[model samples]
Target: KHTVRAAGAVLWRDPATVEVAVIHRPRYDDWSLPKGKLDQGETEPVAAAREIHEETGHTAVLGRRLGRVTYPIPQGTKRVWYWAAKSTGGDFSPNDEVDKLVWLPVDAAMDQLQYPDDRKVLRRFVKRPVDTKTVLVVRHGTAGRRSRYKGDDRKRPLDKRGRAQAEALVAQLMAFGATTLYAADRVRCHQTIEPLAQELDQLIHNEPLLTEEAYAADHKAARKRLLEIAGRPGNPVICTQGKVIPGLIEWWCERAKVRPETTGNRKGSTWVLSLSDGELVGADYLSPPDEK
Candidate 1:
C-alpha cells in the first residue's frame, strides 16, 4: 500500500458560545470539515488554511493541532492532519467542491458532521478556550556559511534554498493570523520573514535584544521583551537565530509549566505559541517546509 498526506482544520468561532464551520461537498454529497491534500512543498499548516479557503472561502488562523486520522483509500493509506483553527474572515459561495457552508453550534456541529472522526476532532477543539491567540517564533532560514562570508555576520542573507523556504513561510505564518512582525535586527532574520512582511504590507520591528549576542548579554531583558510581545494584543511573528530560538522556548515553556518534548532550532522552522489572557496556553512546532 502507498501513503498519502492531507491536512485540514475544525474551524471555530465565538469564545463564550462556540460554533464550528462544516461544509457540504458536492461530490460526496455529505457534510464534513474543510480539508484537502497538501500541495507540493506545502506544510500541513499552510495547506490547512488553503483548503479551508478553497472549500469554505473562510480565512483561518490555526490553533493547536487537534490530531491525525489514518484510513484506507482505494490505492493507499490516507493520513489526515487536523488543527483547531479560528475563522478570521472571508465569505462562502457555492463552489464545485463545496456546495454549502454552514455555521453550527458546538453540539449541533457534532451532530451535523457525517464522520465520527470529525466529531472527535470537534470534541477536542471544544475542550480549549476559543480566545487563544498565536505568537510565532521562527529561526532564520539557512544563510551562507559564516566561515565563507567576509562581511559582518549580522548582514548575512538567505541562500537560494533559504530564499525558497522564506517564500514558503509566508502562508504558514499568515495561517496563524500573524500581523505584527519582529526580527533580531540581523539581515538573515529579517530576510527570512521579508516575503511574509511584503504580503501583509507591514514593517518588521527590529528587536536588538532578540539577537544572540544581545540575548546572551542580557537574558532578563530578552525575556522581558518577549513577554511584552506575548502579552500584546495581536498575533505576532518574531524571526531570530538558532542560538536564541531554543532558549527562549525553554524559558517560556518553563514559565508556562508545560514540558515540551523538544525545543526545535532548525532553520526555517517555527514554534507556534498559543496565548490566552497573557499566558502561554499551548505550543506546537512546525518543521522547515523542505524537511518533510
Candidate 2:
C-alpha cells in the first residue's frame, strides 16, 4: 500500500552486433538489469547514472526513455523507470546488489533476464535504433531583468541565482554525455552552460545564428542551422535564449507532427531531443534543480 520509486537502464553497447548488460543479483538470487531505489532528493537521470556505476561498474551515457515498469513487492508497489544507457569505461566487480555481470547478445539477453519487466525494458531498447544521437537544447539561467540592466544587455552576466542554476546543470547535462558546448553569443546564454563547459574543460562555441536576434532576422536559416548542430557527432549541449527556444522547439515538433508534452520555455530548462539518423524521434523536457 506504499509506492517505492527506482531507476535503471537498458545498458547497451553498439546496437546490431552490440550486446546488453544483464546482471546477476546476489541478495535476491535473480538476474536483473542494474537498477536501484532512488535515494531521497535525487532525480531519475542522476540516480540512473549512479546505479550503473556502483552496481555494474560502468559509466552510463543515458539516452531516451524506455517507459516505466511497476510491480508489487511485499513491502509495497515498486515503480522503476528505465532509459537506454550506453555503457562506457568500467568493469563489473563484487557488490551488495550485484555479484556478476554478463554482456550478452540480444536473444540471449532476453532469455537471461529473470524479471519480465526487465525483458520488457530490453525489448523497448531494441525497438528504437540504439544509435540515436541527442541534442540538449537549454534555455539560459535567469540573468536578472533585461530593462533594469545599466550596462549593455549584450554583456549582462548571470546574477547570483543564475550562476547557482548553472552550477546545478553540470551533472544533468553531463548525464546525457555532453561532449561539446554551444551558446548563442549572449553572455547569459554562454553563462548558462559555463559550469558544464568548465567541467569538461572545453571551450564554448558561440553561435550568433542561434541567438534571438538572428532567429528573428531569419527564422528559416536559424532553424536550418539548429538541425545542423543536432546532427553533429557526439551529444552537443546548446544554451539558447528564451525568445528563440520556444519558437525553435515548436517548429521542430510541429513539423514532425508530435506533441511537445511541454509548453513553458522558462529559463534554466532543457529539451532532450533524441534523433535517429538526423531526425526528431523523441523529445523530453527537463527543468533546472529548484527551477526558479
Candidate 3:
C-alpha cells in the first residue's frame, strides 16, 4: 500500500453569523476547502497555513484540529490533516490551482462543498466558537543533561539540537498566530521560545510561578497564573519544562470536563489551547519539529 500526506483547514470568519472559505479548483473542476501536499520537512500546522495561503490567498491562524480525511487514490492511501483556521487577511486572485474563492455562511458553505469529507470538516468547525482565542503551550527543547550541568538546573540551556528546534518553532508558532511570549524562569524554557520572540520582535515575559519547582510548591497558584494569561486579549506562546506541562494540562482538562488525552511531553512538542472567556474549549498537540 502506498501512502500520501497533506494538510488543510476549514477557513472560517465571524462569530454570530459564521462564514467559511470555499475555493474552486480549475484542475479538478471542484469546489473544496483549500489544501495541498506537504513540502519536504514541513510540519502539519506549518503546511496547513502555507497551503491555505497558496490556494486561497488568505493568511490563516490555525485553530483546533477538526480531524483528518483518509481515502484511497490510484496512487495509494491518501490522508489529509484538517484544522479550523480563522482568515486573518490577504486577497485571492485567479491562479492555476484555484480560479475562484467564495465566502459563504456555514450552511451555504456546507452545501457548496463538493465532497462529503469537506462537509464533515465544516460541521466540526461550526461546533466551536469562531472567535475563540488561542494560547500556545510549548515544552522546552532538549537541554544539557542535569548531571553534566554543575550549576542550578534552572540555569541549564538548550543543546545544539534544541537550538535548531527553537529556530524551527518560529514558523510553526506563527502559523497559529502567536503574538506575545511567556516562559518559565528557566534557561531552557526561555531559550525554547527565544527565537520565536526575536522573529516577532516581541518581549518574552518570564513567569517564575510557572516553573516546576514553583508549581510543585503551589499548583493552584500556577494554574491561576496560566488562566490569567489565557484570558488575556492576544495569542500567547509559553514554554515550560516537562515536569510542569503535563500536570498543568491535566488540570486544564479536568476543569474543562474533557477527557485527558496523552499529550506526549516530548522535547520541543507544543500544545495549542483554544480558550473563550478563560475557559478551555479546544486543544491540539503537535509533535516536535522534524529534524531537517
TM-score each candidate. Answer: 0.88, 0.83, 0.92
- For model 2, the superposed segments whose C-alpha errors exceed 4 Å read 1-5, 38-42, 70-79, 145-152, 256-264
Off by over 4 Å in 3: 148-152, 259-262
* Model 1, span 1-292: residue lDDT tens: 7878899998877743778899998788999989989888889998998898888878877877777788899969988888888887888999788888899998888889989998888887776665688899999999978865543387878999999999999988988889899999899999999999999999999999998888888989999999898877788999998878888898888888855433567899999888877778777788898885
Identify the superior model by lDDT, candidate 2 or candidate 3.
Answer: 3
lDDT (tens digit, per residue) of candidate 3 on 157-250: 8999999899989999999889999999999999999998889899999999998889889999998999888878799998997888989888
Model 3, CA-based lDDT: 0.86
TM-score of 2: 0.83
Q: Which residue window of length 10 is worst by lDDT in model 1? A: 256-265
Q: Can you write out model 2's per-residue Cα lDDT over 141-258, one digit (the tens) per residue?
A: 9888878644337878898988987998888788888898899989999999989988999999999898877888899988988988877788899998877988888899988864
User: In terms of TM-score, which candidate is stronger, 1 or 3?
Assistant: 3
lDDT of 1 at 223: 92
lDDT, candidate 3, at 258? 52
Winning candidate number (TM-score): 3
